[PDB]
Design brief:
This is part of a larger assembly, with chains A (about 50 residues) and B (about 50 residues). Chain A is low in regular secondary structure. Chain A is built from 1 helix and no strands. Chain A is elongated. Chain B starts with about 40 loop residues before the first helix and ends with a helix. The chains are: A little secondary structure (about 50), B mainly alpha (about 50). Chain B: Belongs to the RNA polymerase beta' chain family. Chain B: It is found in: Nucleus; Cytoplasm, Cytosol. Chain B: It comes from Homo sapiens (Human).
C-alpha cells in the first residue's frame, strides 16, 4: 500500500505491506523474569547465596 | 628404616595411623543443627552408643 510517514508527513518511497496477522501473546513476561539481589539469605551450611 | 619403602613420608604420616582408635568430631558449623539434626550427628551418636 501507498503509505504516508507519520513523523515527517511526506510519503514513503517504497510501498508497505499491511495486513491482519494473528499474533499471540506468550507467557514469558518481563515482570516475572526481572530479578536482582544485593545481599540477602544465605545457606546455613555453605555460607553463600 | 622400612617405612619409606612403603612409600610413606614419615614426616607426614606413620603406618600406625591408618587404624583409627580415636576419632575427631566435626564442629557445629560443619553439621548444622537445623537442616532436625544432620546425619553426621546421628552417626556420631550411634558410635558413642555402640562404645
Amino acid at each position: 500500500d501507498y503509505v504516508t510517514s507519520g513523523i515527517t508527513g511526506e510519503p514513503l518511497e517504497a510501498y508497505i505491506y499491511f495486513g491482519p496477522v494473528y499474533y499471540q501473546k506468550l507467557k514469558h513476561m518481563v515482570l516475572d523474569k526481572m530479578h536482582a539481589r544485593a545481599r540477602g539469605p544465605r545457606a546455613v551450611l555453605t555460607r553463600q547465596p | 628404616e622400612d617405612v619409606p619403602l612403603l612409600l610413606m613420608n614419615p614426616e607426614a604420616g606413620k603406618p600406625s595411623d591408618l587404624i583409627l582408635t580415636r576419632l575427631l568430631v566435626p564442629p557445629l558449623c560443619i553439621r548444622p543443627s537445623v537442616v532436625n539434626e544432620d546425619d553426621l550427628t546421628m552417626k556420631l551418636t550411634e558410635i558413642i552408643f555402640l562404645n
